[PDB]
Amino acid sequence: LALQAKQYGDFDRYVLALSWQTGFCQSQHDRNRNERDECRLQTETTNKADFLTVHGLWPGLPKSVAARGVDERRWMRFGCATRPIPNLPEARASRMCSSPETGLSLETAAKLSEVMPGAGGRSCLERYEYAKHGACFGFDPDAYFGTMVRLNQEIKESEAGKFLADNYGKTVSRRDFDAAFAKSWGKENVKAVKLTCQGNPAYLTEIQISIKADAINAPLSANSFLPQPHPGNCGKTFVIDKAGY
Ligand SMILES: [Ca+2]
């Protein structure tokens, strides 16, 4: 349905954060972090684009919150937990299952799980994500996570998703990634994307896309995005990491 804020709704954008799951798993492994079922359970899939999973949907800094002294960096660090407001409990990556249950329906949880391996189970990524980016806005969890699922699907089905699939395990240039994104959404919207990489050579771990809050409930189009200042830390070229360490 439609995603709507009940409070602090005066933000202008959402950042759709999509993990390149294989890369995420590779990174956790390279940094010597204990393996989460997510990754050890991770297998090769027929549609390589399906490795592009949902991390979250992050509302930008609300004007009402910025008005109270909160800057962009502080909002990025604590989200709903920023002080003086919204001042909700801080969501911590070290205890995601300690965040409140979201109240998400079984149906939405099922859909969410297929594209967010960290959701539910003993990981509870959705509890953390909702606590940090949705609770203070009073978002309906079903509309919230349902929207992430849809947006992720639209990205995977676009030339950006096809680009990742066609170049699975290969080294690509940011130039060509941008060309693919631009093919589906326009050259002037290439700036709406921030890529995150790990290692050297760099390999993809995440894609963050800035979307107009006004367009969040409609199918993505060349009028749905907002340029943002950060291209990311991938450099000119990077590897589309394949499953397996
Ligand atoms: Ca890998």
Curated annotation (Swiss-Prot):
Pfam families: Ribonuclease_T2 (PF00445). Belongs to the RNase T2 family. It is found in: Periplasm; Cytoplasm. Contains four disulfide bonds. This is Ribonuclease I. The active site is at residues 55, 129, 133. The gene is rna. It comes from Escherichia coli (strain K12). Monomer.
